[PDB]
Amino acid sequence: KKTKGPDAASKLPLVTPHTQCRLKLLKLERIKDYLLMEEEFIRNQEQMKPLEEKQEEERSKVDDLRGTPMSVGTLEEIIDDHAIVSTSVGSEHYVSILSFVDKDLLEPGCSVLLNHKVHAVIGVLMDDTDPLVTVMKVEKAPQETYADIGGLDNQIQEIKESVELPLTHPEYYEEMGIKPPKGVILYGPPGTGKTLLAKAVANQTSATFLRVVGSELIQKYLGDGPKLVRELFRVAEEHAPSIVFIDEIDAIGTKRYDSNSGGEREIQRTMLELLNQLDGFDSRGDVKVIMATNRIETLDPALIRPGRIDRKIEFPLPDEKTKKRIFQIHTSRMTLADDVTLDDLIMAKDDLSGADIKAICTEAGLMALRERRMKVTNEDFKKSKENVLYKKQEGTPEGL
Amino acid sequence: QELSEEDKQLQDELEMLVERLGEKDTSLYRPALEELRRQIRSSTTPLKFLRPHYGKLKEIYENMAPGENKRFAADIISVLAMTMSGERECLKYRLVGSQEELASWGHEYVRHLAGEVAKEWQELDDAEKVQREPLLTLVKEIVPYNMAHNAEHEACDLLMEIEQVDMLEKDIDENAYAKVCLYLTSCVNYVPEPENSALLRCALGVFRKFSRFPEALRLALMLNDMELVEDIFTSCKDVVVQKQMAFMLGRHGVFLELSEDVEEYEDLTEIMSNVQLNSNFLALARELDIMEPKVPDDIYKTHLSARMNLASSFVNGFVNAAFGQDKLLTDDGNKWLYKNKDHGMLSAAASLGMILLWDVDGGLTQIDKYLYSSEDYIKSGALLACGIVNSGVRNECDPALALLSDYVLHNSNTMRLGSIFGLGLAYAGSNREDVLTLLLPVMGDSKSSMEVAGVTALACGMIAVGSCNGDVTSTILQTIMEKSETELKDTYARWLPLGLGLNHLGKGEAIEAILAALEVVSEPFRSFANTLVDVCAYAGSGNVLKVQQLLHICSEHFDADMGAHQGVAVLGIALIAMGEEIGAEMALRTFGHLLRYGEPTLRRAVPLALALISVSNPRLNILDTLSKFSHDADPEVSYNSIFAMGMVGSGTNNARLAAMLRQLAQYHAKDPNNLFMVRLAQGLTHLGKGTLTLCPYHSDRQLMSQVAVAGLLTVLVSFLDVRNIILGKSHYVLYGLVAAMQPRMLVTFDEELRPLPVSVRVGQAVDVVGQAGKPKTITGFQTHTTPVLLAHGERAELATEEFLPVTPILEGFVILRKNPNYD
Amino acid sequence: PGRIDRKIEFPPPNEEARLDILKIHSRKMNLTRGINLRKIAELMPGASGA
Amino acid sequence: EVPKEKEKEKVSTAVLSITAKAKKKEKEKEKKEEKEKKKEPEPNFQLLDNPARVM
Amino acid sequence: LREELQLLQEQGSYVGEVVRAMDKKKVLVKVHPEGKFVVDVDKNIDINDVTPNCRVALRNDSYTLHKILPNKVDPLVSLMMVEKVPDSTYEMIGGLDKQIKEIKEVIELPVKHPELFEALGIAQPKGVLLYGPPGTGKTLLARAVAHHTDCTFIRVSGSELEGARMVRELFVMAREHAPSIIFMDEIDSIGSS
Amino acid sequence: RALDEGDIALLKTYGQSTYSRQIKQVEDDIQQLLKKINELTGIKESDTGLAPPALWDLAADKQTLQSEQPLQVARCTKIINADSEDPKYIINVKQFAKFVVDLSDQVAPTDIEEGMRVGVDRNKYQIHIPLPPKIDPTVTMMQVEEKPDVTYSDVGGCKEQIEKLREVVETPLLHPERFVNLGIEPPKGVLLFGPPGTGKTLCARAVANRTDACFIRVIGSELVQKYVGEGARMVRELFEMARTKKACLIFFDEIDAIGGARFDDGAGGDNEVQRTMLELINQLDGFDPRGNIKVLMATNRPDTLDPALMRPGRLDRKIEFSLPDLEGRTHIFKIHARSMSVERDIRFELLARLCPNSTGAEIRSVCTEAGMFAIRARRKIATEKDFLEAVNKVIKSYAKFSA
Numbered sequence A: 001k002k003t004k005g006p007d008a009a010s011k012l013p014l015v016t017p018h019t020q021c022r023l024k025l026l027k028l029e030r031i032k033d034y035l036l037m038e039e040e041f042i043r044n045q046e047q048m049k050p051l052e053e054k055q056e057e058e059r060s061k062v063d064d065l066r067g068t069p070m071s072v073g074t075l076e077e078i079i080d081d082h083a084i085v086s087t088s089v090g091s092e093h094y095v096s097i098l099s100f101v102d103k104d105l106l107e108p109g110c111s112v113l114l115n116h117k118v119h120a121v122i123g124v125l126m127d128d129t130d131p132l133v134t135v136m137k138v139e140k141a142p143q144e145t146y147a148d149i150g151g152l153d154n155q156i157q158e159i160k161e162s163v164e165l166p167l168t169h170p171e172y173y174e175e176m177g178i179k180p181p182k183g184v185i186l187y188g189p190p191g192t193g194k195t196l197l198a199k200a201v202a203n204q205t206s207a208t209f210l211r212v213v214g215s216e217l218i219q220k221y222l223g224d225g226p227k228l229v230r231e232l233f234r235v236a237e238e239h240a241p242s243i244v245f246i247d248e249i250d251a252i253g254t255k256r257y258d259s260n261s262g263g264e265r266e267i268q269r270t271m272l273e274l275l276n277q278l279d280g281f282d283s284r285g286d287v288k289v290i291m292a293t294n295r296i297e298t299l300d301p302a303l304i305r306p307g308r309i310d311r312k313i314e315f316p317l318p319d320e321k322t323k324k325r326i327f328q329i330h331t332s333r334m335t336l337a338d339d340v341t342l343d344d345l346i347m348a349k350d351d352l353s354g355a356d357i358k359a360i361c362t363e364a365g366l367m368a369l370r371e372r373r374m375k376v377t378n379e380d381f382k383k384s385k386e387n388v389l390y391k392k393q394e395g396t397p398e399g400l
Numbered sequence B: 001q002e003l004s005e006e007d008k009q010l011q012d013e014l015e016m017l018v019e020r021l022g023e024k025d026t027s028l029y030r031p032a033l034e035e036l037r038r039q040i041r042s043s044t045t046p047l048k049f050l051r052p053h054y055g056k057l058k059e060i061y062e063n064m065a066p067g068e069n070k071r072f073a074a075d076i077i078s079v080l081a082m083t084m085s086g087e088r089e090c091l092k093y094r095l096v097g098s099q100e101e102l103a104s105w106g107h108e109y110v111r112h113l114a115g116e117v118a119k120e121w122q123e124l125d126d127a128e129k130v131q132r133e134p135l136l137t138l139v140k141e142i143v144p145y146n147m148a149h150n151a152e153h154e155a156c157d158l159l160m161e162i163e164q165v166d167m168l169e170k171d172i173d174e175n176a177y178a179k180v181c182l183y184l185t186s187c188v189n190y191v192p193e194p195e196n197s198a199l200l201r202c203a204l205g206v207f208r209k210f211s212r213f214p215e216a217l218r219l220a221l222m223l224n225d226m227e228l229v230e231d232i233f234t235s236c237k238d239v240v241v242q243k244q245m246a247f248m249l250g251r252h253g254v255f256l257e258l259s260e261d262v263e264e265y266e267d268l269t270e271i272m273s274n275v276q277l278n279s280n281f282l283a284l285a286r287e288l289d290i291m292e293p294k295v296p297d298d299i300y301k302t303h304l305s306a307r308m309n310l311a312s313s314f315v316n317g318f319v320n321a322a323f324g325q326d327k328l329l330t331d332d333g334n335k336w337l338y339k340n341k342d343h344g345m346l347s348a349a350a351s352l353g354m355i356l357l358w359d360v361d362g363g364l365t366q367i368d369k370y371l372y373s374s375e376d377y378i379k380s381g382a383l384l385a386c387g388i389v390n391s392g393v394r395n396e397c398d399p400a401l402a403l404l405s406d407y408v409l410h411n412s413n414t415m416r417l418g419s420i421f422g423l424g425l426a427y428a429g430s431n432r433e434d435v436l437t438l439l440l441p442v443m444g445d446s447k448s449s450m451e452v453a454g455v456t457a458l459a460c461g462m463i464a465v466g467s468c469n470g471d472v473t474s475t476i477l478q479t480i481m482e483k484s485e486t487e488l489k490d491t492y493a494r495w496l497p498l499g500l501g502l503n504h505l506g507k508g509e510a511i512e513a514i515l516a517a518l519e520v521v522s523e524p525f526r527s528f529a530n531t532l533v534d535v536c537a538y539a540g541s542g543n544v545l546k547v548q549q550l551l552h553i554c555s556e557h558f559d560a561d562m563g564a565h566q567g568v569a570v571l572g573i574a575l576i577a578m579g580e581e582i583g584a585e586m587a588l589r590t591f592g593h594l595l596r597y598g599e600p601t602l603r604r605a606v607p608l609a610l611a612l613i614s615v616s617n618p619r620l621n622i623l624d625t626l627s628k629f630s631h632d633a634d635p636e637v638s639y640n641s642i643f644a645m646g647m648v649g650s651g652t653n654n655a656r657l658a659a660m661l662r663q664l665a666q667y668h669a670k671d672p673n674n675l676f677m678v679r680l681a682q683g684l685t686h687l688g689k690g691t692l693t694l695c696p697y698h699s700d701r702q703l704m705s706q707v708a709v710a711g712l713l714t715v716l717v718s719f720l721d722v723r724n725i726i727l728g729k730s731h732y733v734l735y736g737l738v739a740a741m742q743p744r745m746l747v748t749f750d751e752e753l754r755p756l757p758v759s760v761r762v763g764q765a766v767d768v769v770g771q772a773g774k775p776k777t778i779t780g781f782q783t784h785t786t787p788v789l790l791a792h793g794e795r796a797e798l799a800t801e802e803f804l805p806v807t808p809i810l811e812g813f814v815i816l817r818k819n820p821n822y823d
Numbered sequence C: 001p002g003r004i005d006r007k008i009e010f011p012p013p014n015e016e017a018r019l020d021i022l023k024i025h026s027r028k029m030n031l032t033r034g035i036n037l038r039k040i041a042e043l044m045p046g047a048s049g050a
Numbered sequence D: 001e002v003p004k005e006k007e008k009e010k011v012s013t014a015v016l017s018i019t020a021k022a023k024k025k026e027k028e029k030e031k032k033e034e035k036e037k038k039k040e041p042e043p044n045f046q047l048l049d050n051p052a053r054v055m
Numbered sequence E: 001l002r003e004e005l006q007l008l009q010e011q012g013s014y015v016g017e018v019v020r021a022m023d024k025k026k027v028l029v030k031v032h033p034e035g036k037f038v039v040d041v042d043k044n045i046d047i048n049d050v051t052p053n054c055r056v057a058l059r060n061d062s063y064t065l066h067k068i069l070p071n072k073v074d075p076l077v078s079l080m081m082v083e084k085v086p087d088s089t090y091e092m093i094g095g096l097d098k099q100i101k102e103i104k105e106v107i108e109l110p111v112k113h114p115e116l117f118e119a120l121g122i123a124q125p126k127g128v129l130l131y132g133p134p135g136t137g138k139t140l141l142a143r144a145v146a147h148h149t150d151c152t153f154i155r156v157s158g159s160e161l162e163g164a165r166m167v168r169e170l171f172v173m174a175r176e177h178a179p180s181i182i183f184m185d186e187i188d189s190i191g192s193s
Numbered sequence F: 001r002a003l004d005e006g007d008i009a010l011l012k013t014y015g016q017s018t019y020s021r022q023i024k025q026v027e028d029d030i031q032q033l034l035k036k037i038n039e040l041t042g043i044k045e046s047d048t049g050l051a052p053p054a055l056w057d058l059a060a061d062k063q064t065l066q067s068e069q070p071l072q073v074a075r076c077t078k079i080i081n082a083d084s085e086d087p088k089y090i091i092n093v094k095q096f097a098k099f100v101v102d103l104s105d106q107v108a109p110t111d112i113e114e115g116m117r118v119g120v121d122r123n124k125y126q127i128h129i130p131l132p133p134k135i136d137p138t139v140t141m142m143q144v145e146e147k148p149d150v151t152y153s154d155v156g157g158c159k160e161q162i163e164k165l166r167e168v169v170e171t172p173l174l175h176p177e178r179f180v181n182l183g184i185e186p187p188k189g190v191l192l193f194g195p196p197g198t199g200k201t202l203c204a205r206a207v208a209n210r211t212d213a214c215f216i217r218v219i220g221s222e223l224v225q226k227y228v229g230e231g232a233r234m235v236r237e238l239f240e241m242a243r244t245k246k247a248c249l250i251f252f253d254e255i256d257a258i259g260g261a262r263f264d265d266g267a268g269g270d271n272e273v274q275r276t277m278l279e280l281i282n283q284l285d286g287f288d289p290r291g292n293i294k295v296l297m298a299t300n301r302p303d304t305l306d307p308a309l310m311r312p313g314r315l316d317r318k319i320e321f322s323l324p325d326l327e328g329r330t331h332i333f334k335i336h337a338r339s340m341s342v343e344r345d346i347r348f349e350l351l352a353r354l355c356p357n358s359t360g361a362e363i364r365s366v367c368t369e370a371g372m373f374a375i376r377a378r379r380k381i382a383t384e385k386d387f388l389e390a391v392n393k394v395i396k397s398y399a400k401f402s403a
C-alpha cells in the first residue's frame, strides 16, 4: 500500500560554514533566489497556458459522469473488465470503472470513489493518508553521513566493505555464486550503541534502513517477530534494498540462555526464524542485517556461527585521537572557545564513550547558558572540565 | 525580580556616577567620566546597567566641551551603541571620537565596528570620499587583529565589501593565506561578474606573491584569461612548476603555443599534447586488469534489427573507447559494415575511431585500410574516425590536417560531413589560424546542404570555443543572411547559434552586439538563436536573471510552432549555473516542477537539462525521477529520459542503474525506437569501462573546460529534437562526447617523469567543519595503488606526508617528489 | 535520551519552605491578627506542601 | 460595441537577491548603454431631419 | 418557515466534519451516521473558503455544502486525558525557589528563544525528569511553566491499561498547539518493565 | 542566579554577526517560500486517471453510461448457508439476513454451492453473480510456494532416507504398482522428521523429480494465529489450493504449534490450536483413499498430539536422518562445489573429516564462507584456490566451535 514518498524537501543541507558569515549569506541568497525563480517558473507556466482547449476535456465527458455525490470505499479484487471493490458498511460492488481508471494507482486495498445511485466506481483516492498498521519505514535512508562520525576509520572501512560487497561489485560473488546475506555482528561497550547506529548511517547513505530495538520476548502466539521483519525486508527488496538494524535484540531477543525448554518460546521461534532469514538459501535480496550488541557473551551459537552470520566486527573504545575528533565534531557547532582547550579534557580521560562526549558537550553549553553567558564564555576552558566530571559515571554504595 | 546583591550595589554605584556626570557644573564632569569608562571597558576584555540611560548619555556627550572630554564621551557612546543601536550611532560617535587604538575595547566591539564600517563604506555616495580614508585606515588597523585572532574570513568579508582586496594581498601572510584563498574561491562561485573577476585577480595576486603557481593556474583557468595564463607561466621558472603547468594545460585540453627557448620544451609540449595520455591510460587499465573488450551482448544480458545491431556496435565502441583493442570491428569489421544496412556504416567506422581515440599512431594505421573503402559512408566514417583519433590529443605534425585534404571541401555531402566533423573534434580548442582559415571558406560554400552548413558551424564553434573569433561570427551571420529564412527555420539551422555561443563561451556582456546584429532575423529562429548564444556565453556564472528570462519566455503559450526555443531555455536553465552543487540540485527541482506542470515541448526538453546538471554523476533522486518519467505518453519525452539516464550514469559502471536500464530494455523490447536507445544508455553507462568520466567540471570539479562543454552541449542541442533528427540521419552527432570524455584516475610521475606506485587514501570528501575556509575533509580511507577512479563526492589524499605533490589538487596527472623529511 | 537532559530532584520542604507555603495558602484566607505561622510549620515534622 | 480584450495570462518575474544583484549590474549597464474638445463641446448642438425620434 | 419545515422533512442539512478540501470544489467531510461522503462545494463559499478541521452542513441526497458550522469536535471531546493552559503562576510556587531556577533555564529558555540555543550550538533540551517524594511532587511547575510558556497542560498518569496507540494522537495531532509541555506523572513503567 | 529576563535579550543582541539577523530573515523567507510551493503543487488532484483513461477508455465509459441501467446488480454480496431439495435456498447473509430467494433465471442451482459468496440485487435479492472469490491473503501467498524447485544430485544424497521415501512418495506418484501387487493404496503417509538439517531438502528433491504437482511449504507457527477460526479457514484454503494445483503434495513444516505440545495447560491455554487440530484431521482424513494427493509432515522432535496413534492408519512411515557421516558430508561438499567457481581438486575430504556431523546446512555455510574469502582476497578464481579454500574452511570451523 506504500511504495515511495515525494522527496521535494531538504534544500541543500550543504551550508559550508554553518556559522553566520558572508559566504553563508551569499549561499542563502542564492538558495532564496532559486526558490522564487521556481515559484516564478511554475506560476508563469501554469497561468501562461500553452493553449485554451475547451474544458481541458475534463468537464465535457468524465466530470459529469463521475457526478457530484460520492462515497469512499476500499477496492478488494480485480477482474479483467470489472473491478471487485469493498465499499463502506461492508458493501461489495462488481462494476467496471472506465472513467479516471488509473489501473496502476487503483490497486487492491485502496480507497476508491462511488458515484451513488447506480453505484459505479469513478475514481481513486491515491493518497488515502492511512497506511498505519505497522510503520517502520517512516525513518528510511537517514540523512546522517560518514562525516558525522570520526576516529573510527578501521570500523568504517570494515562495515563499508561488508556492505559494498553488494551494490558495488555485485558480479564479484555473483560469479563466485554465493550471494551472501551474512550481515554484520557488532560488539561494543554499553556506553555506546547509537554509534552502532552512527556507523550504520555510513551504509544508510545508500538505500533505506529499518530498525527493531527492544521489540519483545515475542510472547505472541503467532510469534512473527522476526517473521514480519522478513516481510518488511521483502518490502525492502521491493524498495531500495534496506538494512535491518536490530541492536539490543540480537542480545536479549536472541539470548544464549542455557535453558532449553520452557524458555518463553523465543528460543523456539525467534532464534530459529532469525537463522532462516539470515540463511541465503531461503530468502534472496541485497538486505544486510546489522546485528549490534553490547553483550558479546550472550551470542547464541546459531548467531555465533560465521557460516550463516559472518562479518563479525568489534567496536572498541575511542582512542586519544578519536576522542579529539569526536569532541571537535560535537563542539564545532558550538564554538567552544577561542583558546581551543582540546587536549586537556581528554589527555587523562579513559573509558569515555560517544554518548558521554555528547552529554558533556551539551552540558557545557547548558552551564554556560545558565549564568556564564559570555558568547564564547571564557569560563568554558575549565567549565568544560567542570561538567566532564558531572559525577553520574557510576554509583553503588561503598563495597570497597 | 531580584538581582544579585553585588550586582545591584554596583548598579546603584553606576547610577550615582551617571547622576554626578549628569550634574550642572562641568568641573566634576571629567573625573566622573574617568571613573566611568574604566569599568565600561571591563567586561569586553556593566553595559546592562546603562540600558535606560540612552537619552541622558546622548545629552551628556553633546553637552561635553570639545576636546578630551568630548571624544571620550563619543567613545563611551560608541561602545554602548552596540546595544542601544537604532542606527549606526556607534560609528558616528567613533568618527567624532578619538580614532586612537580601538582594538583594546573588546572583540565584540571591534567586530561590530568592522561591520558598521562596511555598512558606511557601502552607504556612502560616490561624491563622498572624505570619510572613506578614515574608515580605510580603521580597516587596515583591524585586519591585523583579525589575522592574529583567527578572524581572517570575516576580514575578507569586510575588505571585499569595501573592495579593498588589493591591500588584502599586502596584509595576508602565507601562514594563513591558504584558507583565505579557499574562502575567496568559494565566494567566486556566487559573486557577479565584475567582482568575480576582481576576486579572481586578487586570488592570482596572492598566489603569485606566495609562489603558489599550480593552484594559481587553476584560478587563471577559472578567469579564462589565456594572456594571464601565459604571463604567470612565464612568471614561474622552476622545472617542477613548469612541468605541472603543462599537465594542467594538457589535462584541460587547451594547447598553449609557446617558444622552444624554455627549458625541457620538448617534454612540456608533449605532456601538454597528451601524447603519453594514451600510453598511461592503457598501462593503468592493464594494471587494473580492465582491458578485456566487453562484448555488447553480455552487457545486454541476452540470457532470455539493423538499427538494433547499429546500437550494439555503438555501445561496443563506447565501452572500448580510448582503448584501441577490439577485434569485433578490426578482424571482421569489413564483414560487419557489409552486413550493415543503409546509413549506419559511417557511424560504425566512427565508433571504431571512438575505440582508437587518443591513439594517434595505432589508430591511423588501423584506419588507413578502411580509408580506401568503396562505400561513401564507410569512407566518410573512416575520415570521421581519423578526426576522433586525433581529437583531444595534440600532435607535433598534426596528421589530421594533411589527411583531410580533399575531403575538407569534397563535393560529396557525406564525405565532406565526416572530414568537417573530424577536423572540428581534432582542432577543438586548438584555435589554430590555419585550420580556421581552411574550414571557414568551407562554411562559405553554397553547394553544401543546410545540415552540412550546420556541421561546419559546429566544427568552427568547437575549434574557436571561447575565443570571440570575429571573422567566424561574421561568416556565421553572413551565411544566415544569405540563406533564406523560410528554409532556414525548418529543422537544422539550430547549429549556427551553437557556434556563436561556443565562440563567446564564458564571456558575456559583449553578446548585446551579436544579438543586435541578429535582430534582423525573423522571430521563429531569432528568439531561439539569441537565447542559445546568451545562455552559452553566460554559462557557469550564476546569472539567475538569464534563467528567469528563460523561465519567463518558456512560460509563454507560443502556439509556425516557434515554441521550440522554450527547449533551449530549459537547457539554459541548467547551463547558466551548473557550476556548484547549489544552483544544480534546486534547478533540478525546478525541472521537477517543469515536468510536474508544463508544456509538451517543455517536458520534452527537461530531461536534457537534468542530464546536463549531473552528467556522469548518478544521483539517486535524478535516477528515480528519470526512471519514473521514462514511461511518459510522449515518445520524445521517453527518448530524452532514456538518454538522460545514460548520461548521468555515463562513465560510472553503476551496477544498480545498469539493472534499471536492463529492466527498461525488457519493458521497451516491443518498440525498437526506445529499445535501441536504452541499449545506447547502457553503453553510455559503461563507456570506456567507466575509466573516463563525462562531467565537464574538472580540477576538483570546479573548472569549466570549454571544449568538453562545447561537445556536450552540441549533443544536448542535437537531443533537443532527436525524435526527428536521430531517426532521420544524425547518427554522427553522438560522437561529440570525445571532448567531454576525460579520464578520472590518478597518474603519478616523479621529477624524472616515471610512473610511481605511491599509494593514496581515497574516499568521500565533504565538509565537516565550517568554522573557516578549511580544506575539504575526506573520510573513508580505502587506500590502494595510485590508479583510482575519482568520482563525484569522493576525492584522494596521500597516505603519508612522504610524497609532496606539485599541486594539492589530486586528479588526472600529478608529480610526487620526495619530502625533505621523508625517511 | 529524553531524560539525560536533566535529572532535577524535589527536596521535601524545610521548616522555612513550609512557612512560605502557609503564607501562599493563607494569603487568600482570613484569620486572626496574631499567628506564629513559622512555629506552626515547624511543629509539623517533615511533611510536604500537600 | 468594442470589447477591448486582452488574453495575457501573464505574470511577472519573482527575482530577489543574486538576480537583483546582477540586475543591479544590468542597472549599471542600462544607465548609459483633447481638453478643448471635451470641456465645452458635448454633441448636443446638432440638426436633425424631419423624421426624428424625439421625446 | 413552512418551507424550512418542508426542507427539514428531508432532514434539512446534514452535519459534516470537513477534513480534506480538494482543489476541484471537493471536500471529503465526515458524517456521524455513516462517515466520509465526497461532495462538491456550495456557490456561496469558494474552494479556499473551506477550512479543514471544522464542521459543515450538507444536503439530503447530493449532500452539497450548506454552511460551514463552528467547531463541534472540540467542545465534545475537549477533555479526554489532557488539559489546556492553566494559570497556576510561579508566585503560588514557593519553597522551591532554588529548584525553579533550573527549570526556567532548562525549559523556559528553549521555548521562548531557540535561536540563542541554535547560535549556542547545543539546542536539544527535550526532557526533564522531576523526581521527588509524594505530596510535594504531584503536579506543579507543570502548570506554572504552562502559563509562562502557553504550551499545554497535558497530564497523563501512565497507569492506564494497550499502551500502544493512544499517545500517538497526543504526540502529533491532539496537541492543539505547537508549544507543548506534555507533563507525564509518575512513571509506572518499572525498570525493564 | 537565574538573571534571565531582559539579560538574555541583551546578550542575544550583544554578539552575533553583522548580518546574522539578515540571514535569519533570509532563511525565514526560504521556509516561507518552501511552504508556499508545497501548497502550490503541480497535479493538485488526489483522484488520478487524468487522460489516458479519460480520452479513449472514457469513450467506452459513455458506453457503460448507456448500459448504466444494467451492471448495477452489485449492491451487496454475502455467503449462502444451505438449500432445500432443489428450488429453495436458505441462506445466512452478512446483513444477518435469514435470506431465501428464487435464484436468478440466468443462474442454475448447480453452479451455486453452500458457503459461496453471491451478490444480490437490492430490488429482489436474486442470486445474480455467484462470485468464486478464492482470495488469498499475503501470508497465504507465503504458505503456497514455487512449483519448479529444480532437481539436484539428490541434494547431498543420503541414500537411506531418500530410498525409504521414494517408495512412499515417488512410487505412488509414478503409480506403477500400488493398485494390485501391493495392498490397494500405497503407505498412508510420510513423516520426514529430524534435527535442524537435511529436513525437507529430500522433499524438495522429490518435488523436482515428480510431476508438476509440486509442494507448498506451510509453517505451523504461521498456522497458529490470534482469534478463533482463522487457522481452521487457513488450513481449509491450504487444502483447496493444493487440490486445485494438480492435486499437489501438502508439506506441513514445524509441527509443534499446530499440534502444540503433548499437553494443554487447562484446556484453555491453547484451544485455537485444538480447533485447528479437529479441522485438519477432518481435511487430511482422506475419507475415500486416493493415490492422487500426498501429505508430508516434518518436525524436529516427535511432539505430535494424541492423533499420533490414529496416524498409523493415516500418517505412517516416520523416517529421519540429519546425521551426515564422512561419505554423506563429502557428497554434500561435491554438490555444493558444483556451484561457485570451485573445482574438486581441493582435498575437501580433509575438511569433511575435520567437522564431525556438520549437517548439510553448515557445509553450505562453509562453502559460502569459502566464496566470501575469495572475494575478500579479490580473486574470483576458486577452482585452483584450494589452499585458500582449506584455510578459510578450517578457520571458520574453529570460529563455529569457539568464537
Ligand SMILES: Nc1ncnc2c1ncn2[C@@H]1O[C@H](COP(=O)(O)OP(=O)(O)OP(=O)(O)O)[C@@H](O)[C@H]1O
Pocket (backbone or CB within 6 Å): A281, F155, F156, F157, F158, F194, F195, F196, F197, F198, F199, F200, F201, F202, F300, F332, F335, F359, F360, F361, F362, F364
Ligand atoms: N544433504 C544435504 N545436502 C546439501 N545441502 C543440504 C543438505 N541438508 C541440508 N542442506 C542445506 O541446509 C539448508 C537448509 O536445509 P533444509 O531445507 O533441508 O532445511 P530447513 O527447511 O531449513 O529446516 P531444518 O534444518 O529444520 O530441516 C540449505 O542451505 C541446504 O542446502
Ligand SMILES: Nc1ncnc2c1ncn2[C@@H]1O[C@H](COP(=O)(O)OP(=O)(O)O)[C@@H](O)[C@H]1O
Pocket (backbone or CB within 6 Å): A148, A149, A150, A151, A152, A190, A191, A192, A193, A194, A195, A196, A197, A198, A318, A325, A326, A329, A353, A354, A355, A356, A358
Ligand atoms: N565517535 C563519534 N563521533 C561522532 N559522533 C558520535 C560518536 N560516537 C557517538 N556519536 C553520537 O552520539 C550519539 C550517542 O552515541 P552512542 O554512544 O552510540 O549512544 P548510546 O551510548 O546511547 O548507545 C549517537 O547518536 C552518535 O550520533
Ligand SMILES: Nc1ncnc2c1ncn2[C@@H]1O[C@H](COP(=O)(O)OP(=O)(O)O)[C@@H](O)[C@H]1O
Pocket (backbone or CB within 6 Å): C010, C013, C021, C048, C049, C050, E092, E093, E094, E095, E096, E130, E132, E135, E136, E137, E138, E139, E140, E141, E142
Ligand atoms: N496539592 C497542593 N495544593 C497546593 N499547593 C501545593 C500542593 N502540593 C504542593 N504544593 C506546593 O507547590 C509547590 C509544588 O512543587 P512540586 O510539588 O515539587 O511540583 P510537582 O508536584 O509538579 O513535582 C510546593 O512548594 C508545594 O509546597
